[PDB]
Amino acid sequence: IVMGATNRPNSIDPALRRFGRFDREIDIGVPDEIGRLEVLRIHTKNMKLAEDVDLERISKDTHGYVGADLAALCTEAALQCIREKMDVIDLEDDSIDAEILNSMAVTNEHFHTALGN
Amino acid sequence: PNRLVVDEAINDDNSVVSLHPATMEKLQLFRGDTILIKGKKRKDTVCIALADETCEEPKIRMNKVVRSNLRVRLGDVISVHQCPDVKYGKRVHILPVDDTVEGVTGNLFDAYLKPYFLEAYRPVRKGDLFLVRGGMRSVEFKVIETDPAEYCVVAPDTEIFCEGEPVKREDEERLDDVGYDDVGGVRKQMAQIRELVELPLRHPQLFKSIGVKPPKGILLYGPPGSGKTLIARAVANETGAFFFCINGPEIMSKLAGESESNLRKAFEEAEKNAPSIIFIDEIDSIAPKREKTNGEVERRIVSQLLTLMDGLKSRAHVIVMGATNRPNSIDPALRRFGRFDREIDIGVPDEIGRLEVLRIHTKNMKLAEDVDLERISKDTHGYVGADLAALCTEAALQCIREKMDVIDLEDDSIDAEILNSMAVTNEHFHTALGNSNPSALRETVVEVPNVSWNDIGGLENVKRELQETVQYPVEHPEKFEKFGMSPSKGVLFYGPPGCGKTLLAKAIANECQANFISVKGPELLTMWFGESEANVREIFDKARQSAPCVLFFDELDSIATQRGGGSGGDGGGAADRVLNQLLTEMDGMNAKKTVFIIGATNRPDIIDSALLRPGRLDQLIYIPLPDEDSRLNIFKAALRKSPIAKDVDIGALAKYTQGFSGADITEICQRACKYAIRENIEKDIEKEKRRSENPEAMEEDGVDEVSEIKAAHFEESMKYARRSVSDADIRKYQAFAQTLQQSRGFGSEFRFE
């Protein structure tokens, strides 16, 4: 079985879409609100999310966002949390306290900021 | 407490540094002890710490040699740490400089280093440099290696070896490697890049604990010569990472097959030396936008770059800073997730940015004490950093101009006194600016205009309306969410020409500290005629990234008139490429985004109705001609900079000059100044005539009549006063305002039981 892949069916040469070569076609379209919710839950499962995180709000406010964009949003939120956590952590020190590392965790406002950016 | 500012030291000894006594006590440092000092580029050195009461508590005093060793200059902050582990060197390898040894016979070690280190117990670190005085000459020496392999104190029993090749001075000068301080105008972008890059490379443990994937792809687009290549080197050198630079032209100039080999070797070596940084300078040549795919080599290289970017991994500790002029010029396939996700805009520097760039480029030159760089920065608009460096070079060249007459060209030798007497002057900078040319003038400038409500004359109703529609949703949006209703995402200004609509927009932007973007209809019209309609989406994108923002579409009716609007340009309406794209982008804007858009039109009866539909630009506000107080405000603003004769108070004139637009006010002032100006020059010409009559008559100390702008010349100017707008145009405007108003009936007839 040969699963092709592309962006739009018209971008492919028609000769490939004749019977025998590539007959079935499937549309992996933009995920819906529920789809965005599952994608966010999948990408954020391994991270240290806060107890006040409201992923449903992010899913509702995310329209036109593909899964990769959602992962980028999560990464941006973590980066913003680091932002807030830079002042205490000295950059010139090759070693960083483990307590601060264990204390890091994203917050809903960080997600809001990342979505804004 | 261990960080101190670098300062000049009283002692010139290379291996001795001075610290404030209480500061040493806080660090538990005693006089004569060996201390490890960390400077820039992760370069540290070892010096003998001495107590100096004259040194300020937050300052550390040290000479030029240690400054070079630490790669820091005056004003830089360095860290001092206890180094009680410095062991007496068993063997130290130090070599001289190639140019400093010419004319010296014998063993340079015995002449200079042997007495310099014997019984001095001077700490030495690998790569350290110092100057030793002996035999009437000063010879530079560089430390090659130390027995501990980190640093040691050279004792009398230490065996110092100087058998090796001399060190080249030109190559040694590279040690002044670029840091964050050598760039300017990119403070915010500098922070973004420093974070996104230095954090994972220096402290990946943070991301690992948070379980996130640090970005690999960074794209720095902007104007040519803005300093892109310097930022990456500064970042890499500050993080201590291995930097490998790739230039698009260099890669594309290689023979087929060799470019791919070089690229793969670059990636492979970069991954070997992790943490590493890769700069694909001018990625446009490597991967230009697919407008036409001609040939096979170009496709091969672009696809090779794509697959190489995809194949790289987060654990590899590799970051790829691209570079280009405009993001659209790059092939979209590169901007997909995984390859090049983050994008940064190294835009034109602002006034402060221009100031820092000028101070950076002119620090090494012999500037005069009367140089006013702030004036140059203020007068330099649209100038990129490279243009500023060119301006400085032109100013120096002009100083040379003034200095040519004395210096004979045919003489192979030139006096040293004249050379030491050269120095640029502010007037030279003015001349260079007059001769120079900006490189960036059509690029959308994003900044916070300084116009304030005080500059806005009256218009209390419109002031209130626009503050309502804009100021609140950007100053108090959280409570808008609290109630939650959608805010207005647009507004349209219709009014007479030359009534200060752009001033109003800029003032409202400043009140909210929100960025203002000025886009005129002619520019979009030209770009569409240039078949570059993607510029419109680019404007919308930029306005979005720099939120909060106020996108001001100047002469919105220009496009409609080009198509016709309501006057009947073509047989029908006004919609076209640019207009339709504008509507499409308008309906596609994010409700949560603080991108407010303002449209200005001098002709409301010709604007396409589709643009006025709710959801795109619906709020319509009328801007009347300035009234008595508004006209007074405009008058004083125009004459605010100029002196006026005491006999003339401009409010009296403003009172009776109804029906006259702000442009007419500006021109009345221009003509009044102009007539007073003719008066001044006529007086000067009469003075010159009198002096010609009596050239030898010594000019007495007669108080020169104060050259002011008097009321007679205001009379002469108003004799040529204009009123561009007639009462018929205002009648049309109020007819539109009435067709809009249609408010009556329930003003007071409604009340609940």
Curated annotation (Swiss-Prot), chain A:
ADP binds at residue 43. Transmembrane segments: none annotated. It is found in: Nucleus; Cytoplasm, Cytoskeleton, Phragmoplast; Cell membrane. Belongs to the AAA ATPase family. Homohexamer. Interacts with SERK1, GRF6, KAPP and SYP31, but not with KNOLLE. Component of the SERK1 signaling complex, composed of KAPP, CDC48A, GRF6 or GRF7, SERK1, SERK2, SERK3/BAK1 and BRI1. Interacts with PUX1, PUX2, PUX3, PUX4, PUX5, PUX7 and PUX11 via its N-terminus. Probably functions in cell division and growth processes. Interacts with certain SNAREs as part of specialized membrane fusion events where vesicles from the same organelle fuse (homotypic fusion). This is Cell division control protein 48 homolog A. It comes from Arabidopsis thaliana. The gene is CDC48A. The chain holds residues 345 to 461 of 809 of the full protein.
